[PDB]
Amino acid sequence: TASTFRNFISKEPNSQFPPESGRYHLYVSYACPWASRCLAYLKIKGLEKAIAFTSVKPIWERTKESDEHMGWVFPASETEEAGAEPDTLNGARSIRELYELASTNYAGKYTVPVLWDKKLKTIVNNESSEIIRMFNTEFNDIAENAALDLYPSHLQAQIDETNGWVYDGINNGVYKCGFARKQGPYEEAAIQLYEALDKCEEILGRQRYICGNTLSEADIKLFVTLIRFDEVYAVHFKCNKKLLRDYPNMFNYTKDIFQIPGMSSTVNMQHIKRHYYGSHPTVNPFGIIPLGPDIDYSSPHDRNRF
Amino acid sequence: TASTFRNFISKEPNSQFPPESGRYHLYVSYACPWASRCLAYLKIKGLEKAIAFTSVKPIWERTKESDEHMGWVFPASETEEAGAEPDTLNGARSIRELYELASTNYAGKYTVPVLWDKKLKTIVNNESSEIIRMFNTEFNDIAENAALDLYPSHLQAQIDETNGWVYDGINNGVYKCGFARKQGPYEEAAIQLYEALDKCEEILGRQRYICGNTLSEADIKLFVTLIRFDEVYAVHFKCNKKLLRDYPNMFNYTKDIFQIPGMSSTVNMQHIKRHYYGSHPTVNPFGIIPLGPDIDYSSPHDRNRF
Numbered sequence: 313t314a315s316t317f318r319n320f321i322s323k324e325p326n327s328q329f330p331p332e333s334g335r336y337h338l339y340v341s342y343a344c345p346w347a348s349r350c351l352a353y354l355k356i357k358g359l360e361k362a363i364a365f366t367s368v369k370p371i372w373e374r375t376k377e378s379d380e381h382m383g384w385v386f387p388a389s390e391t392e393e394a395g396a397e398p399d400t401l402n403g404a405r406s407i408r409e410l411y412e413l414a415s416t417n418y419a420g421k422y423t424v425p426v427l428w429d430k431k432l433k434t435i436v437n438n439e440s441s442e443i444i445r446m447f448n449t450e451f452n453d454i455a456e457n458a459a460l461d462l463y464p465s466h467l468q469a470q471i472d473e474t475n476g477w478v479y480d481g482i483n484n485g486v487y488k489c490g491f492a493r494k495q496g497p498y499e500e501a502a503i504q505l506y507e508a509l510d511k512c513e514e515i516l517g518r519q520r521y522i523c524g525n526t527l528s529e530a531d532i533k534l535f536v537t538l539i540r541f542d543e544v545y546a547v548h549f550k551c552n553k554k555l556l557r558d559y560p561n562m563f564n565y566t567k568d569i570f571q572i573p574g575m576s577s578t579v580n581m582q583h584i585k586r587h588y589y590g591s592h593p594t595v596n597p598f599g600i601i602p603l604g605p606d607i608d609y610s611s612p613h614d615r616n617r618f
Numbered sequence: 619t620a621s622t623f624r625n626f627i628s629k630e631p632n633s634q635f636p637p638e639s640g641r642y643h644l645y646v647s648y649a650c651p652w653a654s655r656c657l658a659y660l661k662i663k664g665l666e667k668a669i670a671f672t673s674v675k676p677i678w679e680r681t682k683e684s685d686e687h688m689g690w691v692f693p694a695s696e697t698e699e700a701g702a703e704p705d706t707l708n709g710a711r712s713i714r715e716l717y718e719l720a721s722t723n724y725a726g727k728y729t730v731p732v733l734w735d736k737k738l739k740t741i742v743n744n745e746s747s748e749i750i751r752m753f754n755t756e757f758n759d760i761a762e763n764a765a766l767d768l769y770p771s772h773l774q775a776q777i778d779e780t781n782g783w784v785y786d787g788i789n790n791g792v793y794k795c796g797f798a799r800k801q802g803p804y805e806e807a808a809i810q811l812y813e814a815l816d817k818c819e820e821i822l823g824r825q826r827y828i829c830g831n832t833l834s835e836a837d838i839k840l841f842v843t844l845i846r847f848d849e850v851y852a853v854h855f856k857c858n859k860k861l862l863r864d865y866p867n868m869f870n871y872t873k874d875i876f877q878i879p880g881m882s883s884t885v886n887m888q889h890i891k892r893h894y895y896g897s898h899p900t901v902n903p904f905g906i907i908p909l910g911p912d913i914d915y916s917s918p919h920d921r922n923r924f
């Protein structure tokens with residue numbers, strides 16, 4: 313009956329959602345940067361056994377017969393498309409169906425990520441920024457890497473501040489450029505985007521990570537956008553004043569984070585490219601997929617110089 | 619009454635078109651690479667006084683009321699749009715109108731360039747490859763730079779051979795990528811495109827120009843495509859396996875040719891970008907113009923190292 317799903321896992325008494333192992337399930341798309349945040353945290357914090365995940369198909373399809381709604385769909389079998397698995401948990405065929413199964417009063421969009429609860433058969437949370445916070449603290453009793461803290465108290469002020477202008481300028485900014493229907497609004501977003509990127513470039517020139525000498529939540533939010541920049545945003549969203557490849561610091565910075573154990577696991581460039589170029593006949597009518605620079609992010613970087 | 623306009627200026631007896639000064643007129647668009655070939659030759663060979671030129675508006679508009687045909691149009695006045703001038707010669711309002719005025723039996727496309735004859739009130743030629751040949755030899759009696767030969771006999775074999783695979787792979791190849799409606803054909807064009815570009819890169823690593831140590835016709839045909847690559851082809855036509863900026867030889871090679879006296883005169887990046895992104899609601903519905911890297915091609919190059 314809920315109109316929104318913004319609840320939290322909690323190690324507190326009288327909590328609807330305690331951090332039990334095998335209880336929760338993460339629904340994602342490799343293509344979506346926001347969902348990719350959560351996949352990164354599962355590997356970084358070592359929550360693989362605690363929380364399994366399933367990825368939908370990259371290209372949108374029709375979710376129902378009665379209306380022409382387009383969105384995320386699950387494959388019918390494991391062999392239908394690489395990187396995608398059917399929803400064996402609830403037998404759903406689309407993300408939309410999972411929401412409807414949780415509540416007929418849901419008023420939001422049918423988006424990923426989705427943190428599902430197997431016990432109450434409901435959606436705990438569908439906000440990536442919140443999912444990664446509870447992935448960072450609430451599962452430390454069973455996390456393979458409990459010590460690792462991406463949101464330590466002494467950084468929260470700087471992380472929240474960084475997240476601020478990085479969200480508006482970069483994470484969400486690339487979409488402002490792509491969804492712009494007028495020249496003025498486009499240039500506003502593009503200008504502000506490369507102001508933010510230059511700002512990052514200067515920071516990462518003095519230190520290894522965006523908020524100091526250690527990895528933080530801010531780095532994961534930034535990385536998921538950068539890893540998609542030259543292949544998608546630079547063409548699909550017309551963000552071409554400068555490519556990531558041309559930012560020496562951010563470029564090696566992306567390689568560095570990509571090469572962190574378990575991170576490359578969460579980058580599926582096929583799903584990334586297939587989704588953006590294949591699910592928007594508005595912006596890309598014939599659904600052609602650019603060749604792309606095909607950069608090897610496993611290749612050497614210079615970020616150890618710090 | 620002619621169905622085609624493929625005639626030649628000639629210093630021969632009994633020739634319909636002798637190379638008289640002030641007799642012929644060149645109609646172009648700064649945006650079109652093929653037309654830009656001819657502008658380059660006018661400045662290189664020093665034919666400014668001999669042959670005047672007029673540029674149409676970059677963005678296509680309706681040419682008639684009775685049908686919805688879109689194409690080149692002249693401004694009504696000199697102040698309507700920079701880089702464009704009205705057709706004061708024949709008072710035409712579109713390129714289409716110039717063709718119809720030449721012959722009601724014309725069966726080709728209403729394209730630029732157009733080499734017009736003021737005497738017979740007709741179109742001499744509308745093929746860029748041919749226009750530049752007669753710009754190179756037939757006006758040497760009045761050319762400010764008569765000595766300069768871009769198609770000297772001892773290079774014709776190599777120039778024609780270079781022009782061969784450069785036309786299919788690069789000059790026309792970028793369009794094969796952009797007009798591709800299917801993935802397979804796109805990848806064919808994109809693959810073949812970057813095979814040709816790599817081939818150029820290797821050549822220009824051993825020598826200054828594409829056909830040896832001196833500028834030739836082959837260089838002008840290549841340059842007009844390269845100067846448009848990162849701003850247009852790399853995004854609009856999805857040619858993004860590699861940007862020109864990333865080819866050190868071809869990149870400086872483009873700067874070198876750009877800086878040849880009178881060449882920069884023929885590069886109007888505004889017209890270039892406005893046309894491609896503004897005249898195809900098919901490929902680019904909202905007609906948004908990417909910010910673009912805004913490269914200064916007047917900046918220093920390393921091509922004198924030869």
Ligand SMILES: N[C@@H](CCC(=O)N[C@@H](CS)C(=O)NCC(=O)O)C(=O)O
Nearest residue numbers: 344346421423424425438439440441
């Ligand atoms: N606020 C959400 C954003 C999630 C989101 O925008 N997801 C996109 C994928 S990139 C989506 O599933 N969109 C589906 C739709 O709008 O139809 C978060 O940060 O987690």
Ligand SMILES: N[C@@H](CCC(=O)N[C@@H](CS)C(=O)NCC(=O)O)C(=O)O
Nearest residue numbers: 650652727729730731744745746747
């Ligand atoms: N074969 C011609 C090609 C000219 C050409 O394709 N021009 C284009 C501009 S890039 C044009 O005027 N197209 C107009 C149309 O097709 O409607 C040449 O090499 O000169």
